[PDB]
């Protein structure tokens with residue numbers, strides 16, 4: 001938002017700042033039936049026993065499903081792959 | 089120091105809205121100066137020289 | 138010491154500037170771009186590189202299946218820089234013109 | 237020289253302004269962050285030298 005001042009101008013900027021972060025455990029890919037799975041838009045996050053997918057700038061876990069992932073590859077190339085179940 | 093690890097990540101769970109200002113000059117004063125009045129004034133000899 | 142001509146020292150010494158540069162490097166290596174907009178958030182380096190590849194229109198599986206090749210290319214590219222700088226005698230003309 | 241005026245004050249002001257601006261340039265360019273971060277003791281980043 002702009003404001004007028006003598007011999008000058010003043011701007012009022014509105015921004016977005018994250019807060020209250022939490023540490024998690026993550027994996028680059030998920031293996032299932034000998035196929036690799038990568039997230040469409042998000043990152044795999046584990047809370048200790050289960051695995052979810054969430055957006056990067058806000059914590060909102062979801063159930064891993066074939067609608068937010070793509071296979072695109074095999075299970076013997078990626079380093080650090082973790083194998084779990086993908087619901088249909 | 090942030091505890092870097094190769095299987096760990098951090099994700100925010102809340103947000104904040106902030107407002108900040110910024111000041112920028114745009115223009116300055118306009119002036120005009122007359123030669124003879126400043127240097128000589130009302131002397132004909134000074135103007136001729 | 139000349140005739141009325143003196144030279145003043147800068148407020149910030151070279152060590153302080155080096156510390157600033159080191160802090161910037163550590164932040165950008167261990168956090169990505171998150172420390173430039175708020176609290177610094179940790180992330181593994183290959184995942185940050187996958188994000189950056191995704192930011193130019195290339196999918197993540199391209200990075201995740203070519204990690205070693207890209208790492209070797211980056212290592213060679215960073216290695217050649219010192220030789221390129223040393224061999225060229227007029228690489229730093231801009232910083233010499235001021236003096 | 238006292239009869240000439242006040243040129244020396246102008247010269248001093250100009251030079252002092254130049255020096256202050258020179259300090260401000262570096263202060264603005266380099267002091268971007270407020271925290272001094274550190275690298276982990278173990279320098280492994282998935283196969284990348286730094």
Ligand SMILES: *[C@@H]1O[C@H](CO)[C@@H](O[C@@H]2O[C@H](CO)[C@@H](O)[C@H](O)[C@H]2NC(C)=O)[C@H](O)[C@H]1NC(C)=O
Nearest residue numbers: 017018019020021058059100101102103104105
């Ligand atoms: C996110 O942050 C906001 C701002 O602090 C939290 O809202 C506050 O919650 C406390 C606890 O009940 C209240 O006492 C304050 O009055 C709230 N502030 C406002 C402006 O409403 C919010 O609870 C946080 N979100 C979560 C999930 O904890």
Ligand SMILES: *[C@@H]1O[C@H](CO)[C@@H](O[C@@H]2O[C@H](CO)[C@@H](O)[C@H](O)[C@H]2NC(C)=O)[C@H](O)[C@H]1NC(C)=O
Nearest residue numbers: 212213215216278279280281282283284285286
């Ligand atoms: C990063 O590159 C440097 C430079 O090539 C590597 O350090 C070299 O290691 C070999 C084997 O020990 C030595 O013979 C060289 O003298 C080293 N170079 C220098 C400049 O000292 C280093 O090993 C690489 N990083 C990793 C993790 O291997």
Ligand SMILES: *[C@@H]1O[C@H](CO)[C@@H](O)[C@H](O)[C@H]1NC(C)=O
Nearest residue numbers: 020021022023024090091098
């Ligand atoms: C998560 O755990 C690590 C390891 O102890 C710690 O360094 C980090 O501060 C934790 N993150 C949060 C947000 O508490």
Ligand SMILES: *[C@@H]1O[C@H](CO)[C@@H](O)[C@H](O)[C@H]1NC(C)=O
Nearest residue numbers: 046047048049050051052061
């Ligand atoms: C992790 O998420 C699962 C999914 O419901 C839940 O059952 C479990 O209690 C969670 N673990 C913790 C420590 O919150």
Ligand SMILES: *[C@@H]1O[C@H](CO)[C@@H](O)[C@H](O)[C@H]1NC(C)=O
Nearest residue numbers: 031033034075081082083084
């Ligand atoms: C699933 O992952 C575990 C852990 O590495 C591995 O031992 C196991 O062989 C994997 N499953 C299959 C079917 O290979």
Ligand SMILES: *[C@@H]1O[C@H](CO)[C@@H](O)[C@H](O)[C@H]1NC(C)=O
Nearest residue numbers: 092093094095276278279280
């Ligand atoms: C990186 O991952 C490997 C897995 O083989 C692990 O041994 C190592 O401790 C990790 N690095 C750090 C700094 O923990």
